[PDB]
Amino acid sequence: NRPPIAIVSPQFQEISLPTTSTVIDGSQSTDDDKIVQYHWEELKGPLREEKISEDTAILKLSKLVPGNYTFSLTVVDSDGATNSTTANLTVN
Amino acid sequence: NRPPIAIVSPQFQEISLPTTSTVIDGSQSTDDDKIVQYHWEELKGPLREEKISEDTAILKLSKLVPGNYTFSLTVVDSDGATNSTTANLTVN
Amino acid sequence: NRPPIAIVSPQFQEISLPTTSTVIDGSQSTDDDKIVQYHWEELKGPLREEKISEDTAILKLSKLVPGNYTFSLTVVDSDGATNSTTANLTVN
Amino acid sequence: DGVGSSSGNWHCDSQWLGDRVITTSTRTWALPTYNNHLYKQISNSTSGGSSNDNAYFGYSTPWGYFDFNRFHCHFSPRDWQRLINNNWGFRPKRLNFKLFNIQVKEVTDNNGVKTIANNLTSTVQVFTDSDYQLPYVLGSAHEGCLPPFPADVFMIPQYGYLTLNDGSQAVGRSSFYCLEYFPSQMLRTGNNFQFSYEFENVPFHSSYAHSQSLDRLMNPLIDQYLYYLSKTINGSGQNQQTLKFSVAGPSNMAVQGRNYIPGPSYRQQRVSTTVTQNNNSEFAWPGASSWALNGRNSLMNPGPAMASHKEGEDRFFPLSGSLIFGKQGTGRDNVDADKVMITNEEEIKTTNPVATESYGQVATNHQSDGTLAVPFKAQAQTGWVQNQGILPGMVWQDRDVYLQGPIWAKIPHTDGNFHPSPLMGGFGMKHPPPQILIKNTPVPADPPTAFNKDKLNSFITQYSTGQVSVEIEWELQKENSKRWNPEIQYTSNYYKSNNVEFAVNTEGVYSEPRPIGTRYLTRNL
């Protein structure tokens, strides 16, 4: 009964706007059984009129303001074991 | 020579935003002959930078501000007889 | 070794907004050989949060503010000879 | 021939010769006199009006037509079990339609007293549209077909076609087919009718679910000598473009090169049976796939054969992409969800995209990071494909046929078509079995002593009765799979319950609890 292995890639990224739109793949989630869901939550971000809550494997970002970002991918398997790995995104 | 029967559905709706987009079907327009056109006009609305004027059977709404709305569907048949029924839309 | 002939059409246009979106064709670029690229640069425009830089044959315009516009189409052939013809756009 | 001699014996057996299944069937029919022997035209102008979409213009012919294009007319549920459990396909091969034992009865109404005495002289007309020069109306699962339970005596449905209609008004091309203008055959209580029909070469139906997902068709032990692009940036930083390939093996089967791609898709709206999850708005009509030729919409029901839901999402089903048969005793309209039984299609999720999913994605711009003199820094953006047309090498599986499902449907006589398999399921035939329109002749009551040139509108009320027998020999394709894991079969649950499934209730009403598919056996791709 191995717990899932959550591998978010790329881990570190440097992006300078008029191309704020950035995607970090989260589909590289190793487990014996099916990954029932993916959960994305941004722990830290500069104040923005919106807050990042999604369930997609490939997270889509748009309208990124300058600052430092730290996103957290939480995966759950069939049994229920959860492994959370954090991703750091930086915009110039 | 029966005049057209304009039946707008749904008549009453309660919608709370981040889903302002609401559609009220107007295609349920009973008549002997073809309904030549549909006319939609909003009698009352909170002040907005835009005013609802359309000819589509299925009215598409977007960017609805809080308040009370009263839309009016006007149908015309081949002969020219017009029947107008009003729809009330409320957003929390 | 004839230099390219850059023919932008239409030359003059009068457009009044809520239809700012206007396209001026630049694909009518006569030359013996292939036109390697098209270059569009707007010499004069009323102050706007954006500046028109593109390489497409059919220039797409959107969000045009009132004023006078003068766009310049520059074409280059295989050899390198460049012929630049200007287009004047006016919005009411 | 003669009043006191039956004109044909009741055959209802179902022989199983082996590679041939002759399925005779017989039910008793009662046919009234529709429309008082007239040809009244129908339009929404007469039916009280309708929307722009629902306008129609057609004629209400007084003929009744025998319809038997539903699988449970012929196959007793035990035969259907013997045909889905162990068989890899079937197709009709012949037909035989004996209409025998007519008896015409005269109804007299005096002081509200119904006295029914038979006419040993009145005649009932029968003829088969054997050249399809009439508007074919068999092939929409119109509820008039032969009784699921043999004893059940049924009323013959009325025949009325539709033609062109600009609104509710006809146009010049609007055709008016007068049925009596066809050479009938008159039966007068001692005669019988019979035509034999030969089914054309219609392809074997797919009575099997695929045991190999189309995207897992490879070998899980060997690499594939076709390198795929894996990385594009060496590492997080500024100006670090690169282009690194790698072999596509078993460790990463997503990027594996593949010969064939799943079939077409026409995305349907998603509605969940657990009523809580559906959005709190009326999206029945607004928000469902429709094709809308000639400016009038029409639901894409049921559309292209598409899998109902992704593995594990049982509760969901597409809005307008599945046959939804009503259980016996259900209301005509506005019935609850539990009184109608929904046909889910998880059986072809292998080689068909999910009905509610968006068939992959296609890139929409060029990932030219740094361009020469026109810099945009445009990242590779991808857009979804809600609807995808048939491409080079694409495979798919046609829709299933259920016990309560249609058999055939005339392929419209058009200059071209693609894969004519009727979307409701069944067989597509350019020359389907003909209609059999039956009408009992008018017999005017008592015309005046003085001449009168009118149409003689006073007829005496009467109807008919008899039996109808449809022997339709199928051809089977036996299965010879070398599978070792026991096959999956269709069974009736062994558990005590108030009524036996597919058996009559205490009152006598024959109840079919669930729709029965025909894809149970497994055949590898």
Added chain:
Amino acid sequence: SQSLDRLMNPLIDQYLYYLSKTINGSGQNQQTLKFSVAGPSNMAVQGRNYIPGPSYRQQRVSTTVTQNNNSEFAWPGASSWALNGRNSLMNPGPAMASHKEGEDRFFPLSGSLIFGKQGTGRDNVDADKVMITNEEEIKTTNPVATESYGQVATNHQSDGTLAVPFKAQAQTGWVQNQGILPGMVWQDRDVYLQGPIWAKIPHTDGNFHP
């Protein structure tokens, strides 16, 4: 003489229930799932075996010159296929009906053969000196050239989701161009007295309905 979407029987229901209602009534938290039979009263949602042929939407231009927009959309804004990096008008394209019943004045920009009457100029002739071949004759089994062949849903109408709430309503997107699907029927283009007879099928490794 039988519209492909009116191929049924207008007198008998169809024993295939369709989803009709989804909310019981206007209010908060009133989801439901009510089916109903698809009969003659509502022929739109009727189950159908076959669907109309392909579509490659053309621009709409109206013969009454007043209605056309006041800009030069001859070249920019017409269907083109453009292999090898050079554009080329989709003239006349896939057999498609020119206009919906009653809209005679319209015609697709580049989707109809337009023969010149005797004595007409080589170029820049007025509209009355060239005679346009309208195709209203196959509006039955072909989608209208200027119309957008139905619509396909683009997201999931999952009102209340588990741990990722979006309240996303069922949104629909149009299908401007649709490829050939399973069981789709259509009718090829007409030949006119002043029209071609034959044309060599290019010697290629494959083609569809040449």
Added chain:
Amino acid sequence: SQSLDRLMNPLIDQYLYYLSKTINGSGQNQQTLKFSVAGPSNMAVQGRNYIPGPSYRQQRVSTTVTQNNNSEFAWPGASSWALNGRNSLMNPGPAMASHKEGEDRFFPLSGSLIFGKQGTGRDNVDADKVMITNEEEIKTTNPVATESYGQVATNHQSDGTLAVPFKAQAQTGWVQNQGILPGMVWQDRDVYLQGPIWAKIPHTDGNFHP
């Protein structure tokens, strides 16, 4: 040796007039409708019997590593078909030409067989140790893999409407993926010396051009 969009005769007009102008000149309320003959001077708008084969747009990656964007778009941003809820690259997909004439360096992300030269590593090899099969050989009768197969109009160019005025200009949308239509020709993929011979057609109830 004959591009599918240059199949005509370059010396004779084509007696099928095409819509050329729509406005007489720059101004207010100057709609018109002027046709002209489609000859050799303008081969783009020439009427054509057949149209290029299917398309399923692939991402574009350039062998000159400098031009590719500075982000990991290997998996996120490549065509995939994804039956049963699990994605899978559209590798190599429908036979499509790798690049437009003159753009040799480019190649679609997941649309070409890429064989490894002898002595190459199993994974994470550089670009020079794997040899890429370019398909410029069928750019004639197939749309370019990285290009967007023309464009289809999405609304009606009804400039002045009766009682519902919008002044909507004819807008065009691209066709990223196009299904097989009536009369469409294409050419199947090439076989290389280091390439497969046969492959079992999956035993399914139907397929197209296996």
